[PDB]
Amino acid sequence: SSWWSHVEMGPPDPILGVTEAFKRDTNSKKMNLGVGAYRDDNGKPYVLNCVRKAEAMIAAKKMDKEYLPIAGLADFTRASAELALGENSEAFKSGRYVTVQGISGTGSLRVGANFLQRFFKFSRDVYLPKPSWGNHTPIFRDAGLQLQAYRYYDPKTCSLDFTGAMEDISKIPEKSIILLHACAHNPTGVDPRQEQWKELASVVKKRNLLAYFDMAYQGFASGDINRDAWALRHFIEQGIDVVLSQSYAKNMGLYGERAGAFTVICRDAEEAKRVESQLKILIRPMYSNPPMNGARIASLILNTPELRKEWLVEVKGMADRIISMRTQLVSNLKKEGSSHNWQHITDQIGMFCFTGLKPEQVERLTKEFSIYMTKDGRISVAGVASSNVGYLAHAIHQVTK
Amino acid sequence: SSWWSHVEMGPPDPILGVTEAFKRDTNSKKMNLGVGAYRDDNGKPYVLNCVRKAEAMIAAKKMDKEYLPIAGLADFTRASAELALGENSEAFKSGRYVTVQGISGTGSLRVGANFLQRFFKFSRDVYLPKPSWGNHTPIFRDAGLQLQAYRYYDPKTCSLDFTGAMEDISKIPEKSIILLHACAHNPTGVDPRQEQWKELASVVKKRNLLAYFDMAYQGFASGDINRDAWALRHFIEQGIDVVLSQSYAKNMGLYGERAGAFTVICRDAEEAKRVESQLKILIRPMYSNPPMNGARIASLILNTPELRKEWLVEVKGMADRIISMRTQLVSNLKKEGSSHNWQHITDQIGMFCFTGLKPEQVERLTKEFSIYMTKDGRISVAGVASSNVGYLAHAIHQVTK
Ligand SMILES: Cc1ncc(COP(=O)(O)O)c(CN[C@@](C)(CC(=O)O)C(=O)O)c1O
Numbered sequence: 177s178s179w180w181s182h183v184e185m186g187p188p189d190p191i192l193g194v195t196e197a198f199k200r201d202t203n204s205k206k207m208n209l210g211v212g213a214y215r216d217d218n219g220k221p222y223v224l225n226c227v228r229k230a231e232a233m234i235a236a237k238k239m240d241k242e243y244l245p246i247a248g249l250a251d252f253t254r255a256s257a258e259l260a261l262g263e264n265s266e267a268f269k270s271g272r273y274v275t276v277q278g279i280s281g282t283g284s285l286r287v288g289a290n291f292l293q294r295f296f297k298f299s300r301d302v303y304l305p306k307p308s309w310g311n312h313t314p315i316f317r318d319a320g321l322q323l324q325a326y327r328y329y330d331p332k333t334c335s336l337d338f339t340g341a342m343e344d345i346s347k348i349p350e351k352s353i354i355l356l357h358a359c360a361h362n363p364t365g366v367d368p369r370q371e372q373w374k375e376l377a378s379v380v381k382k383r384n385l386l387a388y389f390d391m392a393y394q395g396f397a398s399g400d401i402n403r404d405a406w407a408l409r410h411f412i413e414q415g416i417d418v419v420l421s422q423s424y425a426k427n428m429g430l431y432g433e434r435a436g437a438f439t440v441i442c443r444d445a446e447e448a449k450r451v452e453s454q455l456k457i458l459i460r461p462m463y464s465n466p467p468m469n470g471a472r473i474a475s476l477i478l479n480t481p482e483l484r485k486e487w488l489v490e491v492k493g494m495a496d497r498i499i500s501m502r503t504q505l506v507s508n509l510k511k512e513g514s515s516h517n518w519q520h521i522t523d524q525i526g527m528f529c530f531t532g533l534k535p536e537q538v539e540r541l542t543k544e545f546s547i548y549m550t551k552d553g554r555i556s557v558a559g560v561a562s563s564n565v566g567y568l569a570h571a572i573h574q575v576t577k
Numbered sequence: 578s579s580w581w582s583h584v585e586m587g588p589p590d591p592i593l594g595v596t597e598a599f600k601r602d603t604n605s606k607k608m609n610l611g612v613g614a615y616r617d618d619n620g621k622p623y624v625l626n627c628v629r630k631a632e633a634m635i636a637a638k639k640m641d642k643e644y645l646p647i648a649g650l651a652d653f654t655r656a657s658a659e660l661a662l663g664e665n666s667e668a669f670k671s672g673r674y675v676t677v678q679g680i681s682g683t684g685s686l687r688v689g690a691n692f693l694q695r696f697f698k699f700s701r702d703v704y705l706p707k708p709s710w711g712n713h714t715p716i717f718r719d720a721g722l723q724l725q726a727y728r729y730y731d732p733k734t735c736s737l738d739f740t741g742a743m744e745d746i747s748k749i750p751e752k753s754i755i756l757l758h759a760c761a762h763n764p765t766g767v768d769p770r771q772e773q774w775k776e777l778a779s780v781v782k783k784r785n786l787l788a789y790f791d792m793a794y795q796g797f798a799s800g801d802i803n804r805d806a807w808a809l810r811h812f813i814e815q816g817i818d819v820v821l822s823q824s825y826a827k828n829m830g831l832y833g834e835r836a837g838a839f840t841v842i843c844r845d846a847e848e849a850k851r852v853e854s855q856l857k858i859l860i861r862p863m864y865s866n867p868p869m870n871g872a873r874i875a876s877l878i879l880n881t882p883e884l885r886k887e888w889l890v891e892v893k894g895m896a897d898r899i900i901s902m903r904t905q906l907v908s909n910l911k912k913e914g915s916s917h918n919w920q921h922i923t924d925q926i927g928m929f930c931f932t933g934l935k936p937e938q939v940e941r942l943t944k945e946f947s948i949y950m951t952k953d954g955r956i957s958v959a960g961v962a963s964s965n966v967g968y969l970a971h972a973i974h975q976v977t978k
């Protein structure tokens with residue numbers, strides 16, 4: 177017997193594990209529609225133009241690789257706050273916030289759950305939608321809080337169960353924590369309507385719950401960043417002090433560089449100066465300081481007028497294309513002769529489609545066509561190219577026929 | 578009352594907090610001898626030549642920014658294992674290890690403490706030397722283990738208390754955890770002698786303790802990487818299955834890029850395949866996947882024959898210079914007319930000197946000369962340039978006179 181003879185084999189990740197499996201397939205026509213990762217119309221990873229140019233200035237500049245403050249690059253930190261909040265914003269104009277650079281959305285989400293475990297003295301309960309992104313569970317559980325659920329999706333009608341959500345939300349105990357997805361709900365692609373949001377805001381404010389916003393797709397829901405931050409701002413402007421996590425993994429295609437941020441909306445500037453210190457105390461014994469590259473890239477872009485403009489034209493370009501892939505898919509399904517209603521494909525927003533396929537179908541998909549998706553029926557439409565939309569339509573159809 | 582009205586002001590970091598304070602000083606002659614960060618002889622951050630060239634190949638190559646497996650870049654991962662272990666090594670040749678890319682030394686150290694909290698079923702006790710690097714405490718405490726201490730430094734004689742260490746170590750309960758610094762003990766600069774190491778190995782093996790090695794200075798103790806890994810290898814070759822954390826922050830000057838790795842020495846290749854899965858399950862809900870840049874740089878260097886050679890000439894160059902700064906300092910102290918014995922300055926190895934200065938002296942140093950060090954009397958000699966060795970000697974002397 178050794179030290180680790182009792183450590184058993186744990187399973188591959190529900191999501192990430194798909195990329196691993198995909199990797200090993202020898203089928204020349206394999207498609208990885210597992211993770212939410214953008215591909216150009218050639219079905220090739222796409223590094224944004226503004227990104228290529230921002231990296232080049234960094235180089236040109238001959239910058240050091242010295243340790244960053246515990247909290248991250250100030251410029252990035254500040255530029256994020258702003259991207260989330262809006263320049264007009266009183267919250268931002270008053271400095272009543274604390275933004276800390278995190279290890280992308282995941283890392284921010286975690287710093288945040290660990291902050292909460294430590295200082296949220298009113299409850300240990302975090303409420304997640306049904307369904308929610310898989311990683312939300314272990315992130316919160318590992319940080320040490322309890323998990324709960326509120327109704328969200330209605331698979332019978334392929335949309336938001338608003339009456340059920342309102343009922344569940346209306347009964348969450350006061351001062352509990354609720355996780356809401358800012359826009360492009362994962363894995364559903366169905367977000368509450370503006371009017372619906374106004375209503376949720378009321379009940380959240382009414383029940384005095386702490387709103388935890390996960391903002392991983394700003395600019396992917398509508399192709400417009402300010403429109404994507406509506407709901408978030410609407411909440412804060414209603415007097416709800418939220419906490420939020422931002423990812424630059426998809427909107428900037430900085431996936432493996434890992435750039436993100438965790439923000440806390442406080443009552444005052446002084447309150448923020450104290451939350452800040454405790455966040456740093458939290459981060460220090462975790463990874464000490466954050467990865468500089470991704471943050472340097474982001475910041476140069478966010479803070480360089482022409483990089484910001486180009487960035488926005490590119491975020492528009494990526495959303496339009498997913499749209500053109502959605503369109504083409506449904507169209508192909510009818511063309512293959514599909515008797516099914518594929519309306520949700522084009523109804524849904526974001527990088528995926530929550531297709532409704534059963535596990536046997538997902539299974540057949542992988543094995544007969546070398547098409548990889550998650551077991552919940554979620555496909556990354558973001559990863560389809562003009563060249564294989566036909567192939568997918570066909571397979572989806574065969575296994576559905 | 579708000580959400581965070583009860584969150585109090587926590588203090589600035591013992592180490593990192595020094596850089597912050599340093600930042601704000603307007604004294605044109607200020608020196609930051611707080612953190613262990615290398616400066617060239619002009620007292621300027623130094624980005625290694627092999628680094629500048631490896632970054633350039635990355636660019637030239639026009640590589641993607643796609644998500645990395647949960648465990649890191651394989652090449653980096655493997656190249657690390659090797660750097661730690663040696664190519665000859667049976668442990669390495671047998672594949673009885675698991676190396677996971679971490680967020681530098683800190684992040685690896687943490688993934689490791691969280692793994693231990695989760696799977697080390699024999700104790701919750703981690704033994705640290707007296708003194709140890711400040712961050713070791715909160716890293717382990719936050720991960721959830723208990724902290725203990727074993728005697729190490731003897732301030733009366735400015736060296737290792739070998740008889741006291743052996744006594745303390747000889748009584749640590751079986752299957753407990755002990756943290757040992759591979760080389761260039763922080764903040765002491767005094768490492769056990771080869772013969773001393775052989776002896777420690779015996780008692781560790783004898784008491785059946787789990788050896789946790791912190792390898793943040795490989796190549797900084799002697800200017801030779803294989804010599805720096807002696808002790809580590811000696812242990813494993815004695816049959817001790819260690820766990821270790823590596824940082825590329827100093828030896829490669831990748832500070833803010835954050836490249837590191839956590840390794841576990843297992844009994845078999847199959848045991849390693851199972852520890853690996855659990856490590857991934859651990860990492861996933863933490864930061865999901867690691868920062869690619871630093872790892873890409875490291876790997877290209879480690880795995881490119883000519884980059885490895887140049888890298889080694891540069892690691893030699895950095896160690897020699899610290900040595901020349903140590904020499905020059907003591908020399909200057911006598912020249913200023915110091916009545917004190919500064920022998921430890923040149924006796925000590927690594928990036929610092931554990932000077933012995935009292936807090937009032939440290940305080941006067943900062944305020945009258947704008948020279949920043951940690952309160953424990955630790956100065957980063959690595960940060961001295963030919964141009965200010967005189968200034969430091971003089972100040973040290975005034976405040977000591
Ligand atoms: C809702 C949501 N939040 C946070 C994250 C975290 O991403 P980051 O740590 O890379 O910033 C993701 C990632 N969703 C992806 C793209 C990736 C993943 O599973 O990690 C997905 O495939 O669902 C997400 O979908």
Ligand SMILES: Cc1ncc(COP(=O)(O)O)c(CN[C@@](C)(CC(=O)O)C(=O)O)c1O
Binds near residue numbers: 826
């Ligand atoms: C013994 C030891 N282990 C691990 C680390 C972690 O460094 P990394 O996370 O940057 O890889 C350091 C850093 N020691 C420094 C340089 C930096 C610090 O305090 O974080 C020091 O000034 O002591 C260290 O001294």
